[PDB]
Structures are given as C-alpha cells and as structure tokens.
Amino acid sequence: GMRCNERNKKKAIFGEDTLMEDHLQLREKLSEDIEMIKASLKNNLVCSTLNDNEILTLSNYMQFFVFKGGDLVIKQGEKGSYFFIINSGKFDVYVNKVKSMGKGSSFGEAALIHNTQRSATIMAETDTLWGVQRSTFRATLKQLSNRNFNENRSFIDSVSVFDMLTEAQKNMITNACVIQMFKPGETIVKQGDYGDVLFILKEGKATVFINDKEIRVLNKGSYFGERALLYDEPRSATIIAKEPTACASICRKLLNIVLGNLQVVLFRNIMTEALQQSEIFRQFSAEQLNDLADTAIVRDYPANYHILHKDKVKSVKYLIVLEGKVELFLDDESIGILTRGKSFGDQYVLNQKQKFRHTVKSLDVCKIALITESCLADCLGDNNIDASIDHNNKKSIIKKMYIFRYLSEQQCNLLIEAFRTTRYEEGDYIIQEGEVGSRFYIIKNGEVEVTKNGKRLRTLGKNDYFGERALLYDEPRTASIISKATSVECWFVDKSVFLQIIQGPMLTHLEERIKMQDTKVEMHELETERIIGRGGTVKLVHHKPTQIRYALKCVSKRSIIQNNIKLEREITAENDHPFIIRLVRTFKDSNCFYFLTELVTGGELYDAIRKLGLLSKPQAQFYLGSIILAIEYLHERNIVYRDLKPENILLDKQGYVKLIDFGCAKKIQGRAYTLVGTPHYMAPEVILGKGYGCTVDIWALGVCLYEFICGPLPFGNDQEDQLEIFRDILTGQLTFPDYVSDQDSINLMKRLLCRLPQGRIGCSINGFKDIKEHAFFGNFNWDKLAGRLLEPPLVSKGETY
C-alpha cells in the first residue's frame, strides 16, 4: 500500500435564530390567521403606510412557532432579530414580571429595523406565535419596492412621449408612479372626461368603449393617456376593467412637481443634443443651451420652401432640423442635405456681422428650430456676440481647473479679460525646463510637445493648458514645452495680473493646497508630533523634507472585522472640493492602515455652534450654504454621504468648513437599502426600507439647520432608545419654539424635513438650485462663498482640538 505522503493535502473543515427553529412548524394560513396578521401589521410603525398587496406578501412570509408552558421566547440580554404576533395562549413579560399578552397583540418590533439589544423577556404562561425575522422582513421590503421600481421604469421606457427624457429624468418620474387597482367592471377612464392621468396596464385586461360601443380590449403593457400629460383634452374612449387589474399611473400635477413642464423639458433635451453637434455650442453651459432651447423660433414649412435665402431672414444665425429634410446651397451649388436632428450655421454664429451667403430650402414638409441674433445675445448677456463667445470659450476651459473654478464670477471675468495672445514658430520653446516661470498658458491654435531631458512626455492641442503653478509659486519649470507645429498661438496670463485679482484668503488656500497635494511623501520622511484623536487614531505628523505638517489617521488592522475600507479609500481619494477634506496619500503595513490628509486646525462645527449659541440668519446661511456646496459636489458624482451631522465637519483656520468622515458614504447604483447612519439624522425613507438615494443627505441638512436656528434636535431630542428616536422621525410632530421669528427659515426647515422625498425641497429636477434660491438665502452671495470672499461666523485663535 503506497500512501499519499503530501502532509498538507488533507484540510479539516470547521442567537435568537438558533432557538426559534426549535419551535418552527409548517401551518396553512386560514382566513382567521391572515386577517389577524394584516391587522397587526397595519399598526406597525414600519408597515402602516403599505398597500394591501405589500402587506399580503409580507404576511405569507410570517412563520408559525408553537410553544409549551414555561418556554422562553426573548431574553433581556440577547440581541433581537424576530418580531412576533401572538396567535394563541398568553405570554408573560419580565424586564429585569410586567404584563401579559394574548390573541392579537405583538412584540419585538424594534428588531424589524436593527440588531437592537432586547429589553424585556417574554415567556409563555400558557401553551403559538406568528413570527418574522429582520433579514427576511427587510429583504422582502427591498424586493417588493425594487421590482415595483424596475417594472414601472420599463413601462416608462415603452411610453413614446418619454422617449427624449434623459436617464436621470426617467428615473425621477418612475418614482412618481402611483399604483391603482381596478376590480372587474370598474371604469378606469370615462369618454369626454378632461383627465390628466396616464395609465399603464401592468397586470390584467380592460375593454375600450367609444360611444358605448366595444372597440377593443387592452392587455398588460397597453397604455393610454400620454397626451393628457401635455394638453387639456377629453378622453377619446371609455375604458372598463375585465379581470382585476394593475395600473401604473402618472399624474400631470406630480409630473409638474417632479419635472416642471414636460414639453419644455423634452425640447431642452432635444435642442441640447442638436446644439452639441457643433464645436461652438459644445463649449456652452447646460443653462446656456436650455435658454437657447426656451427661446428658439419653431416653424413648420411646406416642401420646396426657402427657409433662408441670402439676406431674406437677416436675424437668423443657426438652424436645426426637428422633422423632415432640407437642402443647403451656396449660390447654385447644393452642398448637402440635413435630416432630423442635424443643423447648420457655425460660420454665422462666430461672425455676427457676416452676411448670410447660403440658402436653405425644404425638401419636404418640415419643422425647423431657428436661433436668432437676439437669442444668442440674450443667452450670453450682451450684444457683442463674437467677443462674448470667445470670452465664454475661455471661461469654459478654466472653469474646469481647481485654481480658477471657485473664484467669484467678477474675478473670473477679470482674469478672462486680462488674457493676452502670442504666436510661436515651430521648435520655439514656449517654456524651457529649469527656468523660473511667471506665466499661465492656454493653447489657442496648434500643437506642442511636453519634454523633459530630451525625452518627450505628451502632446497638447487646442484648448489644452499648461504652466498654472507659476501663478502660485516661484520655482523652476519641471518640463519644456515646444512648439510642434507651424504658427502655434497661445492665450496667456501673468502672475502679476493674477495677484491683482485673487485676494489673500483664497490665494492662501490655493497656495497651501496645490503644494501639499503634489508633494511626494514617504512614511520614513514623516516625523510624528502631538496626538489629536483616539478611537482608529490620528496624529499630527511633520514632513521632514518640506516642514509641511499633515494629519495621519491610523486605523488598526484588527478593526477589519470589512470590505468598505477599499470603498472608502476610493471615495476619499477622488474628492477635490474646497469644503471636503483633501487626501494626500495612503500608506499600509503589517498592523495598520494609514490616511495622510491635509491638517485642519479650527475644530469641529459641533463645538463652534455650541460656542455661538443660536445662529443668526447670516451665520446659518454661511455654514448650511457651505455644507450644501460639499453635498452637491458629492451628489454630482453619485455619492450619497449618509452620515451628515455637525460632528463630521471641521473648520479650517480661516473658519471655512471641511466634511471629513466618509465611513458611511457610498457610490449609489439605483436605490440603496442598507440601514446606515446616525439615528437622529437618518431620513424616514432609510428606516422604512423601501429604498433611498442621495436625497437622504438633504433631510439631514434640515436636521442641521434646525439645530442651528432652533437649538435642540427636531426629533427624538431627549430620547435615548433607538426605537423611540426612529418613531419620532417616522410619525412625530415637527414644531418650532416661539423665539424663532423668521418665517423663511421655518419654511426652509419644514421643506427640508419633508418626510416624503418627492415633496422635499432640492429633490426634484432643478436639484440644489431650489434650495439655493429659497427666500431664506435671499441676501446670500453663493459666489463669494466658494471663493472665500465672506467673513465666516467664527475664526479660531490658534489651533483647537
């Protein structure tokens, strides 16, 4: 017998949920059971706002548990996971005896939300329970809502009137779908009624009656009413349900709340897609394009018509085909045919004064959008269009750069206006490596090469830029830039001009940030100093080569109980906003993870408000406005923060804020369901378990504002119990103290603390713009905030921790 000798070839294999399977038993649900269940659930803080289909599904997941006398169910110490509705016998309760429960009552509702440590201890006096486990319960809620969402979404996709909505806009109105049930013989819509609702058959069938005469029958997927979302019209038919039926419905009143005017939205989308085929309008902003959409002259034309001929329509600069075909001519030569969505006019858009030489002639019946000299001027803010488009093209390039992006509008404009132009010949060194630069460049025409030590590094072309560091530092150029084309033209600005425009506090912020960011740093180059945080642990460290001081968070590797650290690091590294903590580098070893970030020395906002007391309006504008810019930045990158509270915001030494703890943040993909956050700040929709997005961060804004202005928290303020906090959030009353005298503040607080997201301000199509334009922010200059041109409420004297 040969034996295997590879010694390590054979490898060995190694709460309430445990005890409750002892009592589980199959049991058919009779009507008496089902109705008691529905009765119990309709009174549960989580299920009270559910329809009958939802509550029924939940019911069929309940399980039967039988007990004999003297048996235990829950215990005062153990962590809870089950929720029970009593079905027979009596059950005694014993915190630290207290009561007795029988047929109909329920207990352990807190476990339906989180792993709450039990309080009492329920035991069976007599000798059954309907029960359900948290995981099963929340998984069921997730699946119910998620499938409802996905189904309604695809039904939205099949309704032609929504075809030109963007992805984001489609998802927003999917959330507005209401489900209506129709018993057989019920009339869904009646002929001649000026209704405003679109119906989709999700399940069932219905019959169509025109003048009391059967005209056809409708099946799942059939839909009707799409014109009633755009116009005041009478129903063309009477529709009556044969079978019980399921209808996804969208109302126009809700559409207008979620989207505004559907026709206006669809046309912006269409026009924006057309305009962006042009290299010119591709430099315009979304708002600028929307404005051009809102003012374009739309005309229908017969075939063989001269829409534009030489000097005939003198004001038109650009032409977009919406439907049909037109042919372009220069004099007698056809130069092309434009179909649906294509356009013409780049030449005339750029040169306001140039006479239209071309001819446009319809080939068939068509519909045309015309952009005139006045639309352009109105879109841009003045009559000098040529100059204003050049100005705006330069604005577009620098508004993408951190350094220029957050300057006030007047500062930005002054810089654009200071730009000079110069030209180079091929092989000219625009910049020589090693020399001390004082200029910033933007390539207007041509191409250049980036080279260091003879070795090429990159090529740069039109609208590319280089050299910006010379605006902030006195230092040698690290690379040469060489004209790699005939007649390269550059726009440029001098450091001296920049320093006349940017002011001290912004300059200081940029100076310290770029340097710190780009500096290479190694662990052994780092000298620890004093400690400034225990929990992981955070030390004030000191870069030996540069003397630049940083902060270093040390996260014990033993704390890796999980996967989210890989995800937190991803998010934390990508963040590049003035009001969000800037990560420098991440280090790792045997025992500990490391985060190297900028050092923030002004303390927590949690302490600043307790030192200020109750914030005046200007002071609450400042901090809430700051938080709003940070949160808006994250949402644009589809990141939900999920743990907004004053504790998680630091003040830098100039008194501007920095958001810092990204432990609970997440890149959202559709709806999120995980229960995460700090209870006093959590949104109703997180607790209720039917899905949420980025807009939970907006609810927390409201909580914060309320603390700023009113003082205490708005819900669960003197509550310790996690469950009682959630209950006050879900159904408690929101009130304001009598010393709050600002109606606009109260309006804003009430609208940020709106429980259904669809009614929550800042949660519809305009996003944060509805918050920024609220009358609470009336006298507030959002422009000066990001640019550090405002006096902050509180500036630290020296460092604070």
Ligand X SMILES: C=CC(=O)N1CCC[C@@H](n2nc(-c3ccc(Oc4ccccc4)cc3)c3c(N)ncnc32)C1
Q: Which residues of 232-256 are buried (b: 16+ CB within 10 A; e: fewer)?
A: eeebebbbbbeeebbbbbbbbebbe
* Minimum distance of ligand X from residue 577's CB (angstroms): 13
Chain centroid offset of residue 653 CA = 29
DSSP code string of 333-400: EEEEEE-TT-EE-HHHHH-TTSPP-EEEEESSSEEEEEEEHHHHHHHHTSS-HHHHHHHHHHHHHHTT
Q: Name the residues that contact ligand X, by CB under 6 A.
A: 532-533, 538, 551, 553, 572, 581, 583, 595, 597-600, 660, 662, 801
* Binding at 643: pick from ligand X, its own copies, none (beta carbon under 5-8 Å per type): its own copies
- Whether 463 and 401 have beta carbons less than 8 Å apart is answered as no
Report how far residue 290's alpha carbon sits from residue 297's, in angstroms, rounded to the nearest whole number. Answer: 14
Which of its own copies, ligand X, none is residue 614 near (CB under 5 to 8 Å by kind)? its own copies
Tokens 């700040």 correspond to: 681
> Which C-beta is closer to its own copies: that of 1 or that of 454?
1
* 3-class secondary-structure state, position 175: coil
**Measured distance CA(687)–CA(347) in Å, rounded:** 57
How far is the C-alpha of 525 from the C-alpha of 510, rounded, in Å? 24
Instruction: Pick the piece of the chain touching its own copies (CB under 8 A) from 6-14, 190-198, 289-297, 355-363.
Output: 6-14
Establish if 195 lies at the interface with its own copies (CB under 8 A): no
Binding partner selected for residue 556 from ligand X, its own copies, none, CB under the kind-specific 5 to 8 Å limit: none
Q: Is 197 or 650 the residue whose CB approaches ligand X more closely?
A: 650
Angle between helix axes 167-174 and 134-157 (nearest 10 degrees) is: 120
Looking at the Cβ atoms of 33 and 652, the one nearer to ligand X is 652
Cα-Cα-Cα-Cα dihedral sign, residues 380, 385, 387, 392: positive
Give me the amino acid identity at 113: I
Q: What is the dihedral of CA 277, 280, 286, 289, to 10 degrees?
A: -80
With binding defined as CB under 8 A, does residue 11 bind its own copies?
yes
Rounded least distance, CB 139 to its own copies, Å: 6
Q: Could you tell which of its own copies, ligand X, none binds residue 538, using a CB distance below 5 to 8 A set by kind?
A: ligand X
* 24, interface contact from its own copies, ligand X, none, CB < 5-8 Å by kind: its own copies
Judged by CB under 8 A, the residue of 204, 677, 693, 792 near its own copies is: 677
The least CB distance from residue 459 to ligand X, in Å, is: 36
- Full DSSP string of 473-512: ---B-SSEEEE-STTEEEEEEEHHHHHTTS-HHHHHHHHH
Of residues 455 and 611, the one with the C-beta less far from ligand X = 611
Residue 38 binds its own copies, judged by CB under 8 A: no
- In the bound complex, what is the minimum distance in angstroms from residue 485's beta carbon to its own copies? 50
CB of 157 to its own copies, least distance (A): 16
Minimum Å gap between C-beta 65 and its own copies is: 12
Per-residue binding letters, 720-759, with its own copies (x by CB under 8 A)? -----------------x----------------------
Among the listed residues 680, 751, 760, 774, the single contact to its own copies using CB under 8 A? 680
| Cα 680 from Cα 678, distance rounded (Å) | 6
527 binds its own copies (CB under 8 A): no
Give the dihedral of Cα atoms 320, 322, 324, 330; nearest 10 deg. Answer: 0
Sequence-separated (6 or more) residues with CB below 8 Å from residue 41: 47, 50, 55, 58, 59
Give the residue with the Cβ less far from its own copies, 24 or 756.
Answer: 24
CA 222 to CA 176: how far, in whole Å?
19
Distance CA 523, CA 88 (A): 66
Pick the piece of the chain touching its own copies (CB under 8 A) from 46-54, 94-102, 430-438, 711-719: 711-719
Instruction: Please state the residue numbers annotated as binding site for 3',5'-cyclic GMP.
Output: 99, 108-109, 111, 118-119, 458, 467-468, 470, 477-478
- Applying CB under 8 A, among 24, 39, 330, 401 the residue interacting with its own copies is 24
Residue 249 or 597: the one with the smaller Cβ distance to ligand X is: 597
Looking at 65-73, 138-146, 489-497, 624-632, which segment touches its own copies (CB under 8 A)? 138-146
Measured from the CB atom, is 245 or 575 closer to ligand X?
575
DSSP state of 657: E
Strands (E), 172-270: 178-182, 187-189, 197-210, 213-219, 223-224, 238-251
- Minimal distance, residue 590 CB to its own copies, in Å: 10
**553: partner contacted, choices ligand X, its own copies, none (Cβ within 5-8 A by kind):** ligand X
Query: Is 643 tagged catalytic?
Result: yes
Instruction: Give residues 629-658 in contact with its own copies (rule: CB under 8 A).
Output: 643, 645, 647
Angle at Cα 295 formed by Cα 291 and Cα 299, nearest 5°? 140
CA dist., res. 637 & res. 21, Å (int): 45
DSSP state of 734: P
Q: Which is nearer to ligand X, 190 or 539 (CB)?
A: 539
Q: Which of residues 548-587 bind its own copies (CB under 8 A)?
A: 558
533 binds, among its own copies, ligand X, none (CB under 5 to 8 A by kind): ligand X
Residue ranges at the known binding site for ATP? 532-538, 553
Catalytic residue among 196, 643, 652, 728: 643
Among ligand X, its own copies, none, partner that 7 touches (CB below 5 to 8 angstroms by kind):
its own copies
Region label for 716, one of left (φ > 0), alpha (ψ between -120 and 50) or beta (otherwise):
left
Question: Least distance to ligand X from the beta carbon of 659, Å?
Answer: 9
Q: With contact defined as beta carbons under 8 Å apart, do 297 and 370 qualify?
A: yes
> Which one, 587 or 606, has the nearer CB to its own copies?
606
Q: Please answer whether residues 571 and 639 qualify as being in contact, where contact means their C-beta atoms are separated by less than 8 angstroms.
A: yes
Instruction: Output 410 or 559, the one with its CB closest to its own copies.
Output: 559
397 contacts which partner out of its own copies, ligand X, none, CB within 5 to 8 A by kind? none
- Our finding on whether 139 is near its own copies (CB under 8 A) is yes
The size of the interface with its own copies (CB under 8 A), counted in residues, is 43
- Could you give the CA distance from residue 341 to residue 277 in angstroms, rounded to a whole number? 9
305 binds its own copies (CB under 8 A): no
Distance CA 501, CA 461 (A): 28
Binding site for its own copies (CB under 8 A): 1-5, 7, 10-14, 21-22, 24, 26, 57, 60, 114, 139, 142-143, 558, 606, 609-610, 614, 643, 645, 647, 663-664, 675-680, 707, 710-713, 737
**Residues carrying an active site annotation:** 643
